Amino acid sequence: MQIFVKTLTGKTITLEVEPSDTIENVKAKIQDKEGIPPDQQRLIFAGKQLEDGRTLSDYNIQKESTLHLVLRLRGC
Amino acid sequence: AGLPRRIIKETQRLLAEPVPGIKAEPDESNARYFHVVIAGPQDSPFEGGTFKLELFLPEEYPMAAPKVRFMTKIYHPNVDKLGRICLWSPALQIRTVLLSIQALLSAPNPDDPLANDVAEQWKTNEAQAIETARAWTRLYAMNNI
Amino acid sequence: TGLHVHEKIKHMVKNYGTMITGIPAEILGQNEAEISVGYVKKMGNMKENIAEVVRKSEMTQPTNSAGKASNEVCDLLLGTEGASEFEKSSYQVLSGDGSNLKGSLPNKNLLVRVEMDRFNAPQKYQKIKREEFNPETAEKNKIYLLEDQLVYLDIFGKVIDLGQTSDTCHRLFNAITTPFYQNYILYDEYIDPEESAEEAAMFEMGEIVKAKMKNIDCWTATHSFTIFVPESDSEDTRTLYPYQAYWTSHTLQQWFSGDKDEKLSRLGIDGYIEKLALLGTTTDSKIRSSIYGELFSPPGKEHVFCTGMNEKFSPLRVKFKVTEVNPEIALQNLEEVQEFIDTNYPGENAKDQCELYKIKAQEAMTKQLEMRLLIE
């Protein structure tokens, strides 16, 4: 299935994924297309942070969902 | 029912081989709690202070992280008004945590991701923040035995 | 000249931060509103709920992702088409003492891009019955001890058999009997194999996993940066300038502001490459941790960056690629960004221009959120 990963600068990245795919697998697909190390990526879906050890399925992410690739970490 | 092997043996090594510059010993009543004393590093704004921390080993330890809180009041970007600390691999251990807390005192300048009020003051008015940390050190971390 | 390239991008990043991408401030505000609409509290004073999220937003502070910083530098020094060509070419693994990168730096204006990987081998295990094992929902990057098989479930959720016999696995499974150690870590320094059958089985399983992991690809990219190596009139004063951001620590603006590019430049080319090569070949975490700190900490944190919980326990590997930089193209890209900023965000100094850009971004974010969550 296809999902869209959108950035703050207005970039949209289209990914071919399976619902079983891990968040880490999504970040490696982003690395393949944009050259960003998965360790220095944050993913957001409908207000919620996507944690690496989880799957797309853990967040009920279905076909043609839009994720946000956040590239400024903030926390505390 | 009682403590797991891991905590018994790690506590023994922690008492036999303490972290240099750090006092850490289990509570006499509940061996999952540790009373910690860290000296303010020389040349830091915390010089002269001694800082008491409580460290707690949750039932999930080491598969979950120890919980840690300053009991001494301290002006630091990574420490809030409750003494909670902002900073987990179950391959790590208590001494690893203590080393990281000590390093926080040696290099208090805030990392970029921090956004709390003390971190912002330390970032925008560093000389004033340092003077404030020294005042709190003298007020709360000294005459504190 | 190449040195002018370095001074200009440093000056502009220092002065302008995130504005270096030449994105209209209203685009950032609108995209941040899209990202953050779910952060706004649904009850109470919604206008006040919106204002809180906008205040807390940081859409006009620079990226601190090292990969985004590298993309920014590549696009500016190479142009969009040139950066796209650079990305198409392959990474080379840095050799043992860095000789292959040394022999790839002729005396021209050059841009290096580095991708560093860490070896993210499993540290956890658990027992499980075959009928219970669901790789989709099971904890990832982890060893599973079944009654008839030993497997590794990688970060992508693929099952990898570790080549043990059913007899071996049955014994190991039934030797680990304490409830606490059903789900635990490998390589725990506090077990004593000579004290119990369980501790011996845990150690034995750890030795099996360690040997199998030697031939399993556990590499995942952890850091990214670029090195500008300008043309030098004499090869004896040829210096290099590393550029980076770092996720948990700092932006490229702060890197430049603290002059760490210049500090690392004082090592010289051979001195820097030799430290980078040792980082990728050393098997000692105490050596690895120091060099990592020296090279990649923000200025002033070199001695604490990789201490305690951040000790560098895992093998690293350094990969690089090199391409030539046309200073006229680089300077033209930087000047067009400067023209964009001066046209759309005019001001007496850089600080005024940055504040104007920020106020405009906050207003765009506010208007979009209020439009979507209130009725005028």
Author numbering:
A (entry chain E): 1 to 76
B (entry chain C): 2 to 88, 95 to 152
C (entry chain A): 9 to 384
How do the authors describe this structure?
Here, we demonstrate that MavC actually targets the Ube2N–Ub conjugate to catalyze an intramolecular transglutamination reaction. MavC-catalyzed transglutamination proceeds via an obligate thioester-linked intermediate to form an isopeptide bond between Gln40Ub and Lys92Ube2N. Architecturally, MavC1–384 is composed of three distinct lobes: a core globular domain (CG) flanked by an insertion domain (residues 128–225) on one end and an α-helical extension (HE: residues 33–66, 356–384) on its opposite end.
Initial substrate engagement by the enzyme involves recruitment of the E2 component of a conjugate through interactions primarily involving the insertion domain. This is accompanied by rotation of the insertion domain to bring the E2 into an approximate productive arrangement and allowing placement of Ub into its binding pocket, as captured in two of the structures of the substrate complexes (C2221 and R3).
